Design a protein around this ligand. Sequence first.
Ligand SMILES: [Mg+2]
Ligand SMILES: [Mg+2]
Ligand SMILES: [Mg+2]
Ligand SMILES: [Mg+2]
Ligand SMILES: [Mg+2]
Ligand SMILES: [Mg+2]
Ligand SMILES: [Mg+2]
Ligand SMILES: [Mg+2]
Ligand SMILES: [Mg+2]
Ligand SMILES: [Mg+2]
Ligand SMILES: [Mg+2]
Ligand SMILES: [Mg+2]
Ligand SMILES: [Mg+2]
Ligand SMILES: [Mg+2]
Ligand SMILES: [Mg+2]
Ligand SMILES: [Mg+2]
Ligand SMILES: [Mg+2]
Ligand SMILES: [Mg+2]
Ligand SMILES: [Mg+2]
Ligand SMILES: [Mg+2]
Ligand SMILES: [Mg+2]
Ligand SMILES: [Mg+2]
Ligand SMILES: [Mg+2]
Ligand SMILES: [Mg+2]
Ligand SMILES: [Mg+2]
Ligand SMILES: [Mg+2]
Ligand SMILES: [Mg+2]
Ligand SMILES: [Mg+2]
Ligand SMILES: [Mg+2]
Ligand SMILES: [Mg+2]
Ligand SMILES: [Mg+2]
Ligand SMILES: [Mg+2]
Ligand SMILES: [Mg+2]
Ligand SMILES: [Mg+2]
Ligand SMILES: [Mg+2]
Ligand SMILES: [Mg+2]
Ligand SMILES: [Mg+2]
Ligand SMILES: [Mg+2]
Ligand SMILES: [Mg+2]
Ligand SMILES: [Mg+2]
Ligand SMILES: [Mg+2]
Ligand SMILES: [Mg+2]
Ligand SMILES: [Mg+2]
Ligand SMILES: [Mg+2]
Ligand SMILES: [Mg+2]
Ligand SMILES: [Mg+2]
Ligand SMILES: [Mg+2]
Ligand SMILES: [Mg+2]
Ligand SMILES: [Mg+2]
Ligand SMILES: [Mg+2]
Ligand SMILES: [Mg+2]
Ligand SMILES: [Mg+2]
Ligand SMILES: [Mg+2]
Ligand SMILES: [Mg+2]
Ligand SMILES: [Mg+2]
Ligand SMILES: [Mg+2]
Ligand SMILES: [Mg+2]
Ligand SMILES: [Mg+2]
Ligand SMILES: [Mg+2]
Ligand SMILES: [Mg+2]
Ligand SMILES: [Mg+2]
Ligand SMILES: [Mg+2]
Ligand SMILES: [Mg+2]
Ligand SMILES: [Mg+2]
Ligand SMILES: [Mg+2]
Ligand SMILES: [Mg+2]
Ligand SMILES: [Mg+2]
Ligand SMILES: [Mg+2]
Ligand SMILES: [Mg+2]
Ligand SMILES: [Mg+2]
Ligand SMILES: [Mg+2]
Ligand SMILES: [Mg+2]
Ligand SMILES: [Mg+2]
Ligand SMILES: [Mg+2]
Ligand SMILES: [Mg+2]
Ligand SMILES: [Mg+2]
Ligand SMILES: [Mg+2]
Ligand SMILES: [Mg+2]
Ligand SMILES: [Mg+2]
Ligand SMILES: [Mg+2]
Ligand SMILES: [Mg+2]
Ligand SMILES: [Mg+2]
Ligand SMILES: [Mg+2]
Ligand SMILES: [Mg+2]
Ligand SMILES: [Mg+2]
Ligand SMILES: [Mg+2]
Ligand SMILES: [Mg+2]
Ligand SMILES: [Mg+2]
Lengths: 87, 81
Amino acid sequence: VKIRLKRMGSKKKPFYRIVVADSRFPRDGRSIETIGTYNPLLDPVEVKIDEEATLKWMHNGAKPSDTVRNLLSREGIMEKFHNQKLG
Amino acid sequence: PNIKSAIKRVKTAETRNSRNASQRSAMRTAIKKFDEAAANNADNAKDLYVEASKKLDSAVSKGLIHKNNAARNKSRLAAKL
RNA sequence: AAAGAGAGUUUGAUCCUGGCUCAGGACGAACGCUGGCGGCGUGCCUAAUACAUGCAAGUCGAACGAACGGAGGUCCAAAGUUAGUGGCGGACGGGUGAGUAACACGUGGGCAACCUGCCUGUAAGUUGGGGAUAACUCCGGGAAACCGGGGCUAAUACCGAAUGAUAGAGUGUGGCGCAUGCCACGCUCUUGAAAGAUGGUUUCGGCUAUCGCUUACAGAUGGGCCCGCGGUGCAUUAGCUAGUUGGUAGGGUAAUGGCCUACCAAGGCAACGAUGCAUAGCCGACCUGAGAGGGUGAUCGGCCACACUGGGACUGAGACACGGCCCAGACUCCUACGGGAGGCAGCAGUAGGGAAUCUUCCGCAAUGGACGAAAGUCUGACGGAGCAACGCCGCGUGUAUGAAGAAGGUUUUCGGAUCGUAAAGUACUGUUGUUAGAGAAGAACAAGGAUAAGAGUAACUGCUUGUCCCUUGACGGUAUCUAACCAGAAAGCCACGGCUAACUACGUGCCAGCAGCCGCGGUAAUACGUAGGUGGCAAGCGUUGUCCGGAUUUAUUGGGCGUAAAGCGCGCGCAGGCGGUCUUUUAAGUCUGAUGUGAAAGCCCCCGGCUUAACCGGGGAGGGUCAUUGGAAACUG
Ligand SMILES: [Mg+2]
Ligand SMILES: [Mg+2]
Ligand SMILES: [Mg+2]
Ligand SMILES: [Mg+2]
Ligand SMILES: [Mg+2]
Ligand SMILES: [Mg+2]
Ligand SMILES: [Mg+2]
Ligand SMILES: [Mg+2]
Ligand SMILES: [Mg+2]
Ligand SMILES: [Mg+2]
Ligand SMILES: [Mg+2]
Ligand SMILES: [Mg+2]
Ligand SMILES: [Mg+2]
Ligand SMILES: [Mg+2]
Ligand SMILES: [Mg+2]
Ligand SMILES: [Mg+2]
Ligand SMILES: [Mg+2]
Ligand SMILES: [Mg+2]
Ligand SMILES: [Mg+2]
Ligand SMILES: [Mg+2]
Ligand SMILES: [Mg+2]
Ligand SMILES: [Mg+2]
Ligand SMILES: [Mg+2]
Ligand SMILES: [Mg+2]
Ligand SMILES: [Mg+2]
Ligand SMILES: [Mg+2]
Ligand SMILES: [Mg+2]
Ligand SMILES: [Mg+2]
Ligand SMILES: [Mg+2]
Ligand SMILES: [Mg+2]
Ligand SMILES: [Mg+2]
Ligand SMILES: [Mg+2]
Ligand SMILES: [Mg+2]
Ligand SMILES: [Mg+2]
Ligand SMILES: [Mg+2]
Ligand SMILES: [Mg+2]
Ligand SMILES: [Mg+2]
Ligand SMILES: [Mg+2]
Ligand SMILES: [Mg+2]
Ligand SMILES: [Mg+2]
Ligand SMILES: [Mg+2]
Ligand SMILES: [Mg+2]
Ligand SMILES: [Mg+2]
Ligand SMILES: [Mg+2]
Ligand SMILES: [Mg+2]
Ligand SMILES: [Mg+2]
Ligand SMILES: [Mg+2]
Ligand SMILES: [Mg+2]
Ligand SMILES: [Mg+2]
Ligand SMILES: [Mg+2]
Ligand SMILES: [Mg+2]
Ligand SMILES: [Mg+2]
Ligand SMILES: [Mg+2]
Ligand SMILES: [Mg+2]
Ligand SMILES: [Mg+2]
Ligand SMILES: [Mg+2]
Ligand SMILES: [Mg+2]
Ligand SMILES: [Mg+2]
Ligand SMILES: [Mg+2]
Ligand SMILES: [Mg+2]
Ligand SMILES: [Mg+2]
Ligand SMILES: [Mg+2]
Ligand SMILES: [Mg+2]
Ligand SMILES: [Mg+2]
Ligand SMILES: [Mg+2]
Ligand SMILES: [Mg+2]
Ligand SMILES: [Mg+2]
Ligand SMILES: [Mg+2]
Ligand SMILES: [Mg+2]
Ligand SMILES: [Mg+2]
Ligand SMILES: [Mg+2]
Ligand SMILES: [Mg+2]
Ligand SMILES: [Mg+2]
Ligand SMILES: [Mg+2]
Ligand SMILES: [Mg+2]
Ligand SMILES: [Mg+2]
Ligand SMILES: [Mg+2]
Ligand SMILES: [Mg+2]
Ligand SMILES: [Mg+2]
Ligand SMILES: [Mg+2]
Ligand SMILES: [Mg+2]
Ligand SMILES: [Mg+2]
Ligand SMILES: [Mg+2]
Ligand SMILES: [Mg+2]
Ligand SMILES: [Mg+2]
Ligand SMILES: [Mg+2]
Ligand SMILES: [Mg+2]
Ligand SMILES: [Mg+2]
């Protein structure tokens, strides 16, 4: 179980969905529950995320990827997760 | 085979096959002796029974039998006495 | 809010009935003529026919085998950065649609009848022994795949022991349910575990950090089994079945179950279509249609089955396993004739079949996988480039002016009309194009160094979070932009009697021929061939094949049976369909509210992003005789 990044859009124009799914499934195939969007083309990155289901999945054992970890850090999910673990 | 991993896997397959067959045969022979003793007269039987259960329990620790299988066999052959 | 077009054809003329044909839309399409560009997509529908060539699954030295500088002895050299056994992965990812009419799929449930490596959290423990074995080295069989024997050695390799069960039995208490039974706790006895590796500190003993290993309990995830309903042709296919139907005991599996065995009884399914034959993967969905319906399963997403044909098992948490193993069968290849090797329905590519379908290319930069503590390796997944007007969308081949009207074709009632403001001339632009230059996003990182704060500790090392420093592009000098030159380098196809938009002349003479139909051709042809003209579309235009519409031509929506096709020759009647009046009661049908669900993508509505569009993104809506449950009682029951 990983909160993954699914790619779609068009040729040379990618758009990404922050989604949780199993590591044995295809990248664009079956998934569990989408939570956010990620657009790389714009110079200021526009990332929307639930920030509530994400924490539940992190509590339940959903390890993210490198860029998903970076996004959760910038949006404050990782720091709040650390605070919840301490508290 | 034509993959470097397949040859190692098949060699490990024969090794594990020999080992598991040996332990499984030993456990079946212990069970057979116990049920032979239990079916006819009393004699030790119960004295055998203990180690028969042992042959099952350790087997679960080896990985060649399921825990539910061991519990089911132990309960089923415990009804003979 | 939605809401449906007809025409020709039986007759000397009519009106009905009825069939046939045409006018529209859509392809994974094919063929003919033709052909400028850009963006986004698609491309063996036939032989699940046979396969050259290369690449597609490997990785860990933190568990046991390297060159150099270089201790030491003008010569050789000790220690310091690189095969295999073992662990994990190969069951993912990728490809085909053969088989299958069935719990395979869709939808909705049940499991008090189940399993689950890795991932997360918690509670305990990682205490002591043994015997080996590859690798390596000798002896042989060897044509070669490779076989045996002798000796030697490690481990996170293997096997006992100490101790630890919510595992088996025996019991008790309490609370409970959907019959079998579930939950909390207590008592006695019998069994079942481990492995260490990289550092820190300390005294060095110890202690400690990270990754590890054993047992138990939850979460998450992925699977297993059972069930109600739903989706095809034939009755010129009427009986089928015997482990079949049920029970009593037993075996087996993770689990229930004739799943299997012995015994007992003769059952079970079927006109609400059993059994059999034929065809076919299923769905979200696609085409058409006013809608109801009809046809199909191309691309993409989910489930299922298969891997040359047939059978079987091992290892493993998970396989009866595309690139794993054994046997038989057909085919290809090597042989010293004893015997061996192989499976493109993986990515490219070859032969054959076809009316018909592509490069034997680049890269792990991005996303995601497997291994590892990390750097890192692999990844024909994937990100990209090449070919084909195969489809959708977008742009161009110039623009304004230029006359009773250049010149020349076509006709002429030979005065003229027509091509036609169309030309030349005139003034202008460069979307394309040529030449020369500037030239992005896609990049987040990971790791490495400092930091600041936490938990842990006797202290550290390390760990978690936060802030900075440095590094990374196949596409690719690609999109894009800037300047100079140029009307120059860029238009074709079908049709013209009616259906249906658009006519003149010549040639031919029931010949040549045209044709979807009415039908044209025998000397004055708007239908045959050509020329001029005109109409439609446009880098496309025509022809063919398949589906829907028109077709109310299977009529529930939406037809009929006196004479056009259509009432059995008549009766008695089983099953089935329907049923006079009133009252009380039930909620099966009926109507309605709430909960859960009907994935994503697709149609539709509103917003946006690409110079517009195609295209892409966000939100919303739609779709069920669906399960739980609360309501009303007019109507059918
Ligand atoms: Mg990443
Ligand atoms: Mg033991
Ligand atoms: Mg088990
Ligand atoms: Mg017609
Ligand atoms: Mg063509
Ligand atoms: Mg041409
Ligand atoms: Mg184009
Ligand atoms: Mg095919
Ligand atoms: Mg090695
Ligand atoms: Mg698959
Ligand atoms: Mg299919
Ligand atoms: Mg030892
Ligand atoms: Mg030894
Ligand atoms: Mg030794
Ligand atoms: Mg004990
Ligand atoms: Mg106890
Ligand atoms: Mg219950
Ligand atoms: Mg107790
Ligand atoms: Mg023991
Ligand atoms: Mg670690
Ligand atoms: Mg380790
Ligand atoms: Mg359907
Ligand atoms: Mg269908
Ligand atoms: Mg039974
Ligand atoms: Mg078929
Ligand atoms: Mg389409
Ligand atoms: Mg219609
Ligand atoms: Mg289709
Ligand atoms: Mg296909
Ligand atoms: Mg599909
Ligand atoms: Mg195959
Ligand atoms: Mg084949
Ligand atoms: Mg096994
Ligand atoms: Mg495989
Ligand atoms: Mg293959
Ligand atoms: Mg291929
Ligand atoms: Mg060919
Ligand atoms: Mg990569
Ligand atoms: Mg990666
Ligand atoms: Mg490789
Ligand atoms: Mg590909
Ligand atoms: Mg590609
Ligand atoms: Mg083509
Ligand atoms: Mg095109
Ligand atoms: Mg166009
Ligand atoms: Mg021109
Ligand atoms: Mg001009
Ligand atoms: Mg002009
Ligand atoms: Mg003339
Ligand atoms: Mg002009
Ligand atoms: Mg120049
Ligand atoms: Mg330059
Ligand atoms: Mg240039
Ligand atoms: Mg830190
Ligand atoms: Mg930091
Ligand atoms: Mg910076
Ligand atoms: Mg720096
Ligand atoms: Mg650097
Ligand atoms: Mg990188
Ligand atoms: Mg390059
Ligand atoms: Mg270049
Ligand atoms: Mg350019
Ligand atoms: Mg110039
Ligand atoms: Mg010039
Ligand atoms: Mg030019
Ligand atoms: Mg010019
Ligand atoms: Mg010009
Ligand atoms: Mg042209
Ligand atoms: Mg003509
Ligand atoms: Mg003409
Ligand atoms: Mg024209
Ligand atoms: Mg109809
Ligand atoms: Mg009629
Ligand atoms: Mg009548
Ligand atoms: Mg009649
Ligand atoms: Mg009559
Ligand atoms: Mg009659
Ligand atoms: Mg009658
Ligand atoms: Mg009746
Ligand atoms: Mg009545
Ligand atoms: Mg949907
Ligand atoms: Mg899709
Ligand atoms: Mg716009
Ligand atoms: Mg769209
Ligand atoms: Mg959308
Ligand atoms: Mg949407
Ligand atoms: Mg809607
Ligand atoms: Mg009443």
